[PDB]
Amino acid sequence: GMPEDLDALLDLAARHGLDLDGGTLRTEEIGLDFRVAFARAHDGGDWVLRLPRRPDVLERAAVEGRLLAMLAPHLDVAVPDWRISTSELIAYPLLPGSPGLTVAADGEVSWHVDMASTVYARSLGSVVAQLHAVDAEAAAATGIEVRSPAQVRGAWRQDLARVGAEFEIAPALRERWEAWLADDGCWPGHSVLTHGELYPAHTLVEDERITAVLDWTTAAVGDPAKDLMFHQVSAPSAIFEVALQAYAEGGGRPWPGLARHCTEMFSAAPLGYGLYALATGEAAHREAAAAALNPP
Ligand SMILES: CC[C@H]1OC(=O)[C@H](C)[C@@H](O[C@H]2C[C@@](C)(OC)[C@@H](O)[C@H](C)O2)[C@H](C)[C@@H](O[C@@H]2O[C@H](C)C[C@H](N(C)C)[C@H]2O)[C@](C)(O)C[C@@H](C)CN(C)[C@H](C)[C@@H](O)[C@]1(C)O
Ligand SMILES: CC[C@H]1OC(=O)[C@H](C)[C@@H](O[C@H]2C[C@@](C)(OC)[C@@H](O)[C@H](C)O2)[C@H](C)[C@@H](O[C@@H]2O[C@H](C)C[C@H](N(C)C)[C@H]2O)[C@](C)(O)C[C@@H](C)CN(C)[C@H](C)[C@@H](O)[C@]1(C)O
Ligand SMILES: Nc1nc2c(ncn2[C@@H]2O[C@H](COP(=O)(O)OP(=O)(O)O)[C@@H](O)[C@H]2O)c(=O)[nH]1
Ligand SMILES: [Cl-]
Ligand SMILES: [Cl-]
Ligand SMILES: [Mg+2]
């Protein structure tokens, strides 16, 4: 859709050297931190605009920029190349391929790639191995969050306590999550650079192969499984094994309990809803988290 502040946005982009055809500028997605728009330049190039919605987003954006600068040479998929990156505007050339899925504003999901795909599984395992191979000290120097295996497991234990102090949690869910936290077989023995929100909305594809990976704000050194989780819970087990095999062939070090860890981690999504509601303070979020934490 045509932005209501179209006028100011063209001025903003031109002040940064980007001469856009204002007819082409349309808002694609309004995130919690960035408004994202597509636009074409008069020289024909296609562009993505990231517009920070509040000044408190800027120091995280600066870390992500540092991350992306060190990361890009290490991966055989494209990542956003922030040719403009200021306090007022980030912009990068539009990356090729189609999002594997798209989540509308009304929450409905449109799928472009099917999770039974062996080609997609192999591609995902390969890209995640390459990311996981990135030197974690070099990644930590960008400013991203860093957790050892003990701190990964400690953070989940702390989150269960913080959420349980503010919400009623169904006893069967608490017992499942306590059993998960207690089970050494589930937990990683090493930390790696991770994407942190790796699912098909952020993997562009062509012919079921990943061409680019978007949206690196959540990148951190931490649990390898978090970048395989969405595939584990959405793909048939035999297709997740194709991704695990590609991961291992690329140098990844999966552990036997990893698939189960992914499914226990996904069952704990309500903890994330509770943490999000505690951060926003909004009534609708609190009520959504409350319902998810104590299901019928
Ligand atoms: C660079 C600025 C332009 O933005 C683009 O070019 C996008 C990257 C482009 O996308 C590019 C890139 C690519 C690979 O799609 C991602 C290509 O297939 C299409 C034809 O053009 C979009 C996503 C197209 O694409 C369709 O939007 C769907 C959400 C997905 C669908 N797909 C799954 C079949 C795809 O056809 C679409 C048909 O142009 C959307 C249509 C409603 C018109 N847009 C509002 C305007 C006019 C755009 O021209 C633009 C904003 O000015
Ligand atoms: C459209 C479908 C295809 O997708 C593409 O073509 C991508 C956009 C392509 O990228 C395109 C487009 C372009 C401009 O790179 C962005 C071109 O230089 C290369 C040769 O092909 C990737 C990103 C190239 O990998 C990139 O190679 C650059 C030289 C460096 C870059 N990174 C290290 C900074 C790295 O991610 C690569 C060399 O293809 C990776 C290689 C290991 C795997 N390919 C062989 C696969 C099978 C692809 O053919 C594909 C998935 O079927
Ligand atoms: N085709 C294409 N889509 C993109 C690109 N960058 C972002 N998008 C789309 O815009 C959405 C929002 O971008 P994202 O970086 O995730 O920003 P967020 O709103 O902060 O989550 C993505 O999920 C994709 O649908 C790109 O380079 N190419
Ligand atoms: Cl906004
Ligand atoms: Cl983590
Ligand atoms: Mg995103």
Numbering used by the authors: 0 to 295
Paper quotes:
Macrolide resistance is abundant in pathogenic bacteria, and is most often the result of GTP-dependent macrolide kinases (Mph), ribosomal methyltransferases, or efflux pumps. Mph enzymes inactivate macrolides by phosphorylating the 2′-OH of the essential dimethylamino sugar, preventing it from binding the ribosome, and providing the chemical rationale for the resistance phenotype.
Consistent with the flexibility of MphH in our crystal structure, these observations highlight that conformational changes in these key regions of Mph enzymes play a role in macrolide substrate binding.
